[PDB]
């Protein structure tokens, strides 16, 4: 069809941080359409993938993917905490990110 999207768009907000100290090991992700921690409970454990473009040809493609997962909720506005296999480069603050529907519990 016109759309082949099987994921929900998200935004990398920032790391888990205090006022002056940040923790790059945990990233905060804002999923569109979610505004309450109760709705964010559905997305717990869902797989996160960040799609970005590189310059050097690696395996016949210029796109490299960094994988992660949703661990827990954060705050009262539907923001969720995320831990990736490798931490996000911190230059992607505000970059789009993909949250898939698997592993599904429905």
């Amino acid at each position: 069809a016109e759309s082949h999207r099987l994921y929900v768009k998200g935004k990398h907000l920032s790391y888990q941080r205090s006022k002056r100290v940040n923790n790059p090991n945990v990233s905060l992700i804002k999923i569109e359409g979610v505004a309450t921690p109760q709705d964010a409970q559905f997305y717990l454990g869902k797989r996160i993938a960040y799609v970005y473009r590189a310059s050097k040809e690696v395996r016949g493609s210029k796109i490299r993917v960094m994988w992660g997962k949703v661990t827990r909720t954060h705050g009262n506005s539907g923001v969720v905490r995320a831990t990736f296999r490798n931490n996000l480069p911190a230059k992607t603050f505000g970059a789009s990110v993909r949250i898939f529907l698997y592993p599904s519990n429905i």
Partner: peptide, 13 residues
């Protein structure tokens, strides 16, 4: 027909 998510679709509801 293939299943797909459209604009405004919220899988949690």
């Amino acid at each position: 027909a293939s299943f797909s998510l459209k604009n405004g679709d919220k899988p949690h509801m």
